[PDB]
Amino acid sequence: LCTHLSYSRSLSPGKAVFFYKTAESDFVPLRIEVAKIPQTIEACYVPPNVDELYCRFSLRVEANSMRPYVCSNPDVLRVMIGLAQAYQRLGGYNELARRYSANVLRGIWLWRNQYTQGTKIEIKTSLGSTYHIPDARRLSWSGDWPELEQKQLEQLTSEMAKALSQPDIFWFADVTASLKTGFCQEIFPSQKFTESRQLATVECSDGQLAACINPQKIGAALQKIDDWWANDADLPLRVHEYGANHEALTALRHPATGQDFYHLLTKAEQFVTVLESSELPGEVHYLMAVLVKGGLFQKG
Amino acid sequence: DANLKPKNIERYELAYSNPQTIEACYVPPNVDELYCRFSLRVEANSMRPY
Amino acid sequence: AACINPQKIGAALQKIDDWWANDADLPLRVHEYGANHEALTALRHPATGQ
Amino acid sequence: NRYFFAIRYLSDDVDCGLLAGRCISILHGFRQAHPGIQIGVAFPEWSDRDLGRSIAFVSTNKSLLERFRERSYFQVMQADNFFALSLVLEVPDTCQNVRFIRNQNLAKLFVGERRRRLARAKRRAKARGEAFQPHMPDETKVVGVFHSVFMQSASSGQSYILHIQKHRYERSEDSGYSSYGLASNDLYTGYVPDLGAIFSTL
Amino acid sequence: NGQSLFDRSVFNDHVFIDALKHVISRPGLTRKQQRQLRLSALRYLRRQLAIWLGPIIEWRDEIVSSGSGGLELELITQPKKMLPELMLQVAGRFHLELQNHSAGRRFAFHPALMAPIKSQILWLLRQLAYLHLSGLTVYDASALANPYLCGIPSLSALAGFCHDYERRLQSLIGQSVYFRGLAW
């Protein structure tokens, strides 16, 4: 290893905002009511006579895991470059793109608000494509998707596979979903972290406030595609260097097992050798996923 | 510890979050374009030692 | 209001130096010792005479 | 002209909101056996931060209050060293009164209440034959401090919360207590002495 | 003085390090063997725990009996009855002291040593929970010892004092009483 090594993030959303349409104007925000009772109570629900609620966010994808942002060691750099390319030319970006793409179309980024009478998801991109999932309530992590839907997963996978692997393509997606709702259904936006509770909003250009979901909360949902441990797929974990599992309060790739990122980072010379003899194993899939969610890998 | 002994930490002790305070900046909803501006002056001042 | 510092704009404008090693590559910010921040090194170390 | 007795909780881990609810339920059951009675509930350890670890009952009929004290629940809880009980004695003549009014208006702070109110309003319009055209209020309200008591429904499948406020007494009219020995904002006037005094007895 | 009151070398004993290894122990032996090695290690460590806090307890007893602001100074100044409640804090500091030592990096915060250390500390805390004439004042003493010398009053006068004091006491107590020496 070496003293300085960093990657930046290769995939990121902006934030999500809730709103509805009227006959008089196209963008009316969903608002939150507060009573000072400081120590307050507050509430948010769809108001009477609005039949459906809209949620929207934007996504940029960048081929930025091909090269270290900073590296202080010429030998570490030579290897990391050789590895990313050794992988790229055998495929594998398709696999990562398939996993990311599946999560967008499924709709899990809606977290606790998935319980609707029918959710429709529409996607537009900067290359001129449009995708349409008429009903997002039925698509599993594991299983065969119904016809015409399986197909759009392949088409979206292809655009993203490119966005992740070739530079100088400026790829944007614009994701809007519609929630068909109940009579006065409660809505669950992001909460504020404090030292009673408060909810998060954003300001509109006209001064009104609106309910929202934070950027990283959308992001945490998209990248939850780690099921390469213990030969038991279950449900996937949010990619983490130690395999953290918040629900059970544990860690699946505890350093004690030799299965964490840092042990694996030191075997790069051996992986490149294998790729040259090539089948891609779980060990290199994990590593590539972490490099995409870049951060500090230092003080070796 | 020096890539040698992995530290004593019990499994559950790493499932905890690490809170932080940060500043951030985002473009507000419904703005069509953002502008950036600056001025530049150039002087013929390399002809002679200050 | 959010801004970009004067010398940060400046560092970008003066990023012009591909005269070393007879191989242009990418240009460096002009520096008396040829510093290269991305690689944490220096291209015109006094030991070279350059 | 007034008699009382008090109960204190001995355990440091006691949940006041859960436990207080049982004493009220007993009072209610007693009220059902003998409709023509009046017994008030007081909180002599009331605070702005919490409800307190003690409860007291106040009335005017000594012989009736003794009968209440003899209810089996209280006797069991004492025997197992959960409760400390006092005897029935006369209320001191040197104190001030408080109301302990309960406020159902606070229900409107929660989504479930608004949903029910509107569902009824829609249906109610059919008699009028006009289109359902509801009209909502503004974004800011101000309310006073209140504490919660956990309550079970009477012969049904529900549970809910009682919201208690404390008002200072002002004298007028004649009295009456609600089924829970609580006061109402209107047309249910009564009061209790604020016996935070002489509490060294338990 | 702003300095640590803790022992400067209780952790410099190679036996201490061994003792820890023995608490951690090993399979393959009989119950009697394991218990004998274990208990011996614990007794040793018990002593070390008493030594480790030694100068600290010494400070307390000396100062409190006779008549600032750091917790290792203030929490010991408090009532002995309170001391048992400091067990978790002491145990914490203990691991830290090991963490800061060249050898203790192999042991500090190891799960194996948790209960042992805590139990022995708790025990210790529960356990924790010649004629001397002082303050004499003389007015107008003769500072001229002999016609040749000024300074400390003549020693012949102190020997004198010891004896007049002895005679007065002897007339009060029926038993023989005798003064071998006198210090100043």
Place this chain on the structure above:
RNA sequence: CCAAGAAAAGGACUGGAAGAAAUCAUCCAAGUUGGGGACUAUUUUCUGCCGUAUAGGCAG
């Protein structure tokens, strides 16, 4: 049983008068802080009647 034993330093008092610290002065030249991130969970707040009513009052 001490270079041993005993011991009242007291009473009174005018420091005063007078004075100019001043003139002069150039701190300058160059410069990238940066990379990553879940505040909600074994929650307690449901079900109705009167009132034109998301107002105000009520039983369980």
